[PDB]
Design a protein around this ligand. Structure first.
Ligand SMILES: Nc1nc2c(ncn2[C@@H]2O[C@H](COP(=O)(O)OP(=O)(O)OP(=O)(O)O)[C@@H](O)[C@H]2O)c(=O)[nH]1
Ligand SMILES: Nc1ncnc2c1ncn2[C@@H]1O[C@H](COP(=O)(O)OP(=O)(O)CP(=O)(O)O)[C@@H](O)[C@H]1O
Ligand SMILES: Nc1nc2c(ncn2[C@@H]2O[C@H](COP(=O)(O)OP(=O)(O)O)[C@@H](O)[C@H]2O)c(=O)[nH]1
Ligand SMILES: COc1ccc2[nH]c(C(=O)c3ccccc3)cc2c1
Ligand SMILES: [Mg+2]
Ligand SMILES: [Mg+2]
Ligand SMILES: [Mg+2]
Lengths: 427, 54, 437, 334
């Protein structure tokens, strides 16, 4: 069950590149593309993300997309730069200028067909393609505009395949331009319709974690991406390694998404660590469980106590007492059963992987479909309305052929998504 | 109390003890049901592709 | 001699099928390569064990069985397992993508594109039968394949084999070993569709098996291997009468006769004893009275419930090992005066006993210890309806909000089938009430 | 930190228990349908015992014994006593009773009535109270439901001053280990106006329920004499104690009744556990011989005794299972 990876824009390619370099180490794949591991657990499901090639080298089933070559050139010169299939580098030259309209309608429309040709060539090699995963930001133009454009066209050509996304949310705490709420609201409108699963990676959360918890005075995008790549490695563990779960992108959707539009997940991770700073003391199972459920460990800046969990998936990694984990996970649901909906029996599920991530002897990844996620979209909505009520910076979009109506439509649907989440919070 | 119909063999034996006395769809019906659901899938997929065409 | 075909659907059915057929081989002295030295009738014969095994001129004894899964990983381990030579490639059918824990996807979507192939491979075996009695169908309630494709298959077999009986070995869903949040949906859906197509169904609650492995085998976190090797013993006890010389439950029709007076109420409660750990250094062998008394302990039942607060319609005791009728009658007489065993007014209060002098075979290196005598009680008690109640409640909780329903509708299923299925279960729950109280 | 649920609001007993549990600060009340509970203060009817003990990682407990209705139903109580060898027919402490189905144990009841009709014996019975069988055989049929005719004790023990009738109420608590705990404090639900043995259907001096009686509060506050006063009365008027003359018989009936149905309702090896508070109603004749009237599975308490009892329930029936971070009960040994 192969997955086709796509990474669009500056952010998408940078978190995408780190994602591959992380799991490549976990599967014993070196930058050359050669396997040098000690366990065969690493290879049993390596085909989900990697293609087997000449000399039995493993090539990532990844497609790198951008409207400017700047960031993709950095990837190619990066650590695991040469592992990628060079034909899967599809890029323009004009950029998107952090404009959703340029990525979705003008600049991106000119390049999108080239990308889909690569998507097709990769899919035809799949024994049985299960779906796509996309890495991108929502605050920019390419990953945001062209990313959602790609999603729309991928759904057209592969309507029976699962669409998964790692969508990075914009925040004033980590901002490139003021028009990020515009691009984000427009993108969310697309994600609600054309994805089955979306990991909400909030930059506001990633900043706070770096500042408050990790005590990093002035965090960079590199610091932020340590958290992303750690989370991405965690939420894909069940896909990359064999398990009781028999996990794929569809089973995840069926079990996590009780209602199709409400498919925006809160990722979490424990232990929170900074780059370079290695742990010496391992976390006890009670500590992993407590932390992974704490708001301070959530990659989406939302208070889970302000809502209810529809579903939860917790992935423990490393060698540990699976009994103790079950005792702690059952303790979780029994200590605060009020924050779990009573109308979905046994909505919290646990999985284990013997292989831990690099630098940690054990860890815990959290995937929650909470109704508290509305706080995220409400935040974007307020920032959106603040500008939109005065039609500020809108000329950047109308100059690309967009009409005000389309903004109002995107706004309304996101507000609907909020109310929809509020609906089941009072059930 | 009452043991009845005792039957012994080389592999074993069986009996019965009483303590107290007392006081489909057709083939095409199926295939139409399956095809009816398939048409509902194609309609759903058509409404999608039509919406995407817009 | 009349032949029986075993059908293993989904991961649960296949892996349990492996456990059972592994155990069958050890009991009949059949080797992994299919050679059975004790069978002096080379290339054929109409012995009791031929009910489950066909013979080739080369002296190979192959299971009258078919393995089907919508996804190849599980059956591929049978293709490359220790009993790979035992099976014929035509018997091991595999799809390319599973039902994703979705009944509708297994039944309607993917079920439609493989049902004809499966029935053709089943017909392949049926043609090798002198007089086929029927089928033994192993599956899960919670899986998309085990639930979805099973019900579809059970429908077609009733069309292609109307006169043939069909027995079920079904795995009831348990959170401790669940794989999907929607298993209550899949269970209700497959029960409703299969109910009129099943003559006798042996339900096994994974909760019960999980706790028995923890309580009696000291296995802190039972794996599927642990559960199945225990389930295989129960299945073996039930099917022993079909594979050995005897006069009780010699065919599939007799199962319905001796355990199922009312057609719809065809879910006998199974209770097995004793379950002793192999790693138990010192063990005092239990007597006929002790193991028989254990058959009325809820902690030994394949489904946790309280037979005291119900009524029996039938009860069969299946012994294996050093047992004689006298010790059995003595046990029953004692137990009756100390336990609440109420039969329905229109039934005789009695027990159909079956003994096989050969003690229960244990898998070498397994978790079970060798015992001098064991027993499996098959009692059709209304108390098993407690399992339907639990399950129907979990169904109601989710369906009230129509949670996850869109995944089923998206596969071409109608939302009405949820209510029609739940209504049939409501009727079933009441049927148990009229008989029980 | 434990959790519980409430599914019977009209119950005054566990309403106090739920209060006490919350007061410990180690028990959290959940919503009615929240399955992740440690304790269940369930409803009186249609209690779902089938859904108990199936929550992994939760030791579950309920304040009712499944099957205990056999004892707490008049029609079932008689059948239970008549069919159980432990009790059976020659039960000395249970009045002569007969299950009588309306428009069965009729034809056998008439045989009893006639022989006692002939022999000039005391021949009053009660479903209400009459000395003619035909009069209220027409009564059980004109109301519809099942009723039990029972031999009316024509010579009851009568309290002086007043020449008044009474019936004793004992509160018994059976824990998860089936330890039978008799609450040391009972109560005498007396009559206020003298009992007479001629006019029988003036139901104020024959039936001694708190309802009908509400000359109220004349002799004792609220028609409720407690053991201290009743014991003192027996010592002064009859030269005996409550322990000897009555309580030995009461402890005997309570034990005999519960040991009889133990194998049917016991949760010793079950996947869920049960406890239950019972209310045994006794009757004393002039010869100080105690008769069992009925058992109630959902009894209320006396206002004076609510605090002490309800706190007792938490100690031995709840905290015994769910421990936290001189005893008021007489343990009936068996
Ligand atoms: N006792 C036992 N139960 C099993 C086993 N394997 C799976 N199950 C149960 O089966 C349920 C899920 O059904 P599966 O058999 O795994 O899935 P499937 O039939 O292959 O259907 P899909 O994979 O969804 O297409 C879960 O509740 C498991 O507890 C097993 O080996 N032994
Ligand atoms: N055989 C008998 N002889 C004399 N009096 C009797 C009797 N049976 C019942 N009584 C009287 O009947 C009244 C109680 O009847 P019963 O106990 O059946 O009602 P009840 O249980 O619904 C009220 P509570 O719920 O408090 O027990 C008492 O006043 C008792 O004295
Ligand atoms: N976490 C993270 N966020 C980024 C990174 N680069 C840009 N972003 C976010 O994405 C938005 C800018 O989008 P960008 O990816 O640069 O636009 P694009 O290249 O045109 O698709 C802002 O909201 C940034 O916070 C990165 O490396 N890491
Ligand atoms: C909510 O309860 C459940 C029940 C079943 C489930 N399966 C899965 C997955 O397949 C999966 C895929 C990728 C990453 C993590 C998990 C999640 C899940 C949650
Ligand atoms: Mg940028
Ligand atoms: Mg499967
Ligand atoms: Mg032969």
């Amino acid at each position: 069950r192969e997955i086709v990876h796509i990474q669009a824009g500056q952010c998408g390619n940078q978190i995408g590149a780190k994602f591959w370099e992380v799991i490549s180490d976990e599967h014993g794949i070196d930058p050359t593309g050669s396997y040098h591991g000690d366990s065969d657990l690493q290879l049993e499901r390596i085909n989900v993300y990697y293609n087997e090639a000449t000399g039995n080298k493993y090539v990532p089933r990844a497609i790198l997309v951008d409207l400017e070559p700047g960031t993709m050139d950095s990837v190619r010169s990066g650590p695991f730069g040469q592992i990628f299939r060079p034909d899967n580098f599809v890029f323009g030259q004009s950029g998107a200028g952090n404009n959703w309209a340029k990525g979705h309608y003008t600049e991106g429309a000119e390049l999108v067909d080239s990308v889909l040709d690569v998507v097709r060539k990769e899919s035809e090699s799949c024994d049985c393609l299960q779906g796509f995963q996309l890495t991108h930001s929502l605050g920019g133009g390419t990953g945001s505009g062209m990313g959602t454009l790609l999603i729309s066209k991928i759904r057209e050509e592969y309507p029976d395949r699962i669409m998964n996304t790692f969508s990075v949310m914009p925040s004033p705490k980590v901002s490139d331009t003021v028009v990020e709420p515009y691009n984000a609201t427009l993108s969310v409108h697309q994600l609600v319709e054309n994805t089955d699963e979306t990991y909400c990676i909030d930059n506001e959360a990633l900043y706070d974690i770096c500042f408050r918890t990790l005590k990093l005075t002035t965090p960079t995008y590199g610091d932020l991406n340590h958290l992303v790549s750690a989370t991405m490695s965690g939420v894909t563990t069940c896909l990359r390694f064999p398990g009781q779960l028999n996990a794929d992108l569809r089973k995840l959707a069926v079990n996590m998404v009780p209602f199709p539009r409400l498919h925006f997940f809160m990722p979490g991770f424990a232990p929170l660590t900074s780059r370079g700073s290695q742990q010496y003391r391992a976390l006890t199972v009670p500590e992993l469980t407590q932390q992974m459920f704490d708001s301070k460990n959530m990659m989406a800046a939302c208070d889970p106590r302000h809502g209810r969990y529809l579903t939860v998936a917790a992935i423990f990694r490393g060698r540990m007492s699976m009994k103790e984990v079950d005792e702690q996970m059952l303790n979780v649901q029994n200590k605060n059963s009020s924050y779990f909906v009573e109308w979905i029996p046994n909505n919290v599920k646990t999985a284990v992987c013997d292989i831990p991530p690099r630098g940690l002897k054990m860890s815990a990844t959290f995937i929650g479909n909470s109704t508290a996620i509305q706080e995220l979209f409400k935040r974007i909505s307020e920032q959106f309305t603040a500008m939109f009520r005065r039609k500020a910076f809108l000329h950047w979009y109308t100059g690309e052929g967009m009409d005000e109506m389309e903004f109002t439509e995107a706004e309304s649907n996101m507000n609907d998504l909020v109310s929809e989440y509020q609906q089941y919070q009072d059930a | 109390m009452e043991v009845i119909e005792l039957n012994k063999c080389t592999s074993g034996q069986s009996f019965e003890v009483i303590l107290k006395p007392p006081s489909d769809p057709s083939l095409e019906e199926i295939q139409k049901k399956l095809e009816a659901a398939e048409e509902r899938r194609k309609y759903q997929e058509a409404e999608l592709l039509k919406h995407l065409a817009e | 001699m009349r032949e029986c075909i075993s059908i293993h659907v989904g991961q649960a059915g296949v892996q349990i099928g492996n456990a059972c057929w592994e155990l069958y081989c050890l009991e009949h002295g059949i080797q992994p390569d299919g050679q059975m030295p004790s069978d002096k009738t080379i290339g054929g014969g109409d012995d009791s064990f031929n009910t489950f095994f066909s013979e080739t001129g080369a002296g190979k004894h192959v299971p009258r069985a078919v393995f089907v899964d919508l996804e190849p990983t599980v059956i591929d381990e049978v293709r490359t397992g220790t009993y790979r030579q035992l099976f014929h490639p035509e018997q091991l059918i595999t799809g390319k993508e599973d039902a994703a824990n979705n009944y509708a996807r297994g039944h309607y979507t993917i079920g439609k594109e493989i049902i004809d192939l499966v029935l053709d491979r089943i017909r392949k075996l049926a043609d090798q039968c002198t007089g086929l009695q029927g089928f033994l169908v192993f599956h899960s309630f919670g899986g998309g394949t085990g639930s979805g494709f099973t019900s579809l298959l059970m429908e077609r077999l009733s069309v292609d084999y109307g006169k043939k009986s069909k027995l079920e070995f079904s795995i009831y869903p348990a959170p401790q070993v669940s794989t999907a949040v929607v298993e209550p949906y899949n269970s209700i859906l497959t029960t409703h569709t299969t109910l009129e197509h099943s003559d006798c169904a042996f339900m096994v609650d994974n909760e019960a098996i999980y706790d028995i492995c923890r309580r009696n085998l000291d296995i802190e976190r039972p794996t599927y291997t642990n559960l199945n090797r225990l389930i295989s013993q129960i299945v073996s006890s039930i099917t022993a009468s079909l594979r050995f010389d005897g006069a009780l439950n010699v065919d599939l029709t007799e199962f319905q006769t001796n355990l199922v007076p009312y057609p719809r109420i065809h879910f006998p409660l199974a209770t097995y004893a004793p379950v002793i750990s192999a790693e138990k250094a010192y063990h005092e062998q239990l007597s006929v009275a002790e193991i028989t008394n254990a058959c009325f302990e809820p902690a030994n039942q394949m489904v946790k419930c309280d037979p005291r607060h119900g009524k029996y319609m039938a009860c069969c005791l299946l012994y294996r090992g050093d047992v004689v009728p006298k010790d059995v009658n003595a046990a029953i007489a004692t137990i009756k005066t100390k336990r609440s065993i109420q039969f329905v007014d229109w039934c005789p209060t009695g027990f159909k006993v079956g003994i096989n002098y050969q003690p229960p075979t244990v898998v070498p290196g397994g978790d079970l210890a060798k015992v001098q005598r064991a027993v499996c009680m098959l009692s059709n008690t209304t108390a098993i309806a407690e399992a339907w109640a639990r399950l129907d409640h979990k169904f109601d909780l989710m369906y009230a909000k129509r949670a996850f329903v869109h995944w089923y509708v998206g596969e071409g299923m109608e939302e009405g089938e949820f209510s029609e299925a739940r209504e049939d279960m409501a009727a079933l729950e009441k049927d148990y009430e009229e008989v029980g109280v | 930190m434990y959790t519980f649920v409430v599914r019977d609001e009209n119950s005054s007993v566990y309403a106090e228990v739920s209060r006490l549990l919350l007061a410990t600060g180690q028990w959290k009340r959940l919503r009615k349908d929240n399955p992740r509970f440690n304790l269940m203060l369930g409803e009186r009817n249609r209690l779902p015992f089938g859904r108990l003990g199936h929550e992994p990682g939760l030791v579950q407990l309920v304040n009712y014994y499944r099957g205990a209705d056999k004892l707490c139903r008049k029609a079932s109580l008689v059948k239970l006593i008549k069919t159980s060898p432990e009790l059976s027919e020659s039960c000395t402490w249970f009045p002569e009773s007969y299950v009588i189905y309306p428009t069965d144990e009729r034809e056998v009841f008439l045989a009893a009535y006639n022989r006692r009709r002939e022999g000039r014996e005391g021949n009053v019975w009660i479903a209400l109270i009459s000395s003619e069988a035909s009069e209220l055989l027409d009564f059980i049929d004109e109301q519809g439901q099942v009723h039990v005719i029972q031999k009316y004790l024509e010579k009851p023990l009568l309290l002086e001053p007043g020449h008044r009738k009474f019936d004793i109420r004992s509160w018994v608590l059976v824990d998860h280990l089936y330890n039978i705990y008799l609450y040391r404090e009972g109560v005498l639900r007396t009559s206020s106006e003298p009992y007479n043995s001629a006019n029988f259907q003036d139901k104020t001096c024959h039936l001694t329920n708190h309802c009908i009686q509400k000359n109220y509060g004349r002799y004792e506050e609220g028609n409720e004499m407690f053991f201290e006063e009743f014991n003192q009365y027996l010592m002064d008027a009859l030269n005996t104690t409550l322990e000897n003359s009555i309580l030995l018989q009461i402890k005997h009936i309570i034990r005999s009744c519960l040991m009889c149905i133990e194998p049917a309702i016991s949760t010793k090896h079950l996947h869920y556990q049960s406890f239950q508070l019972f209310g045994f109603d006794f009757m004393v004749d002039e010869e100080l011989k105690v008769w069992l009237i009925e058992v109630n599975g959902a009894p209320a308490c006396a206002q004076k005794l609510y605090a002490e009892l309800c706190q007792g329930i938490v100690d031995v029936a709840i905290s015994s299972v769910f421990p936290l971070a001189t005893s008021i009960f007489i343990k009936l040994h068996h």
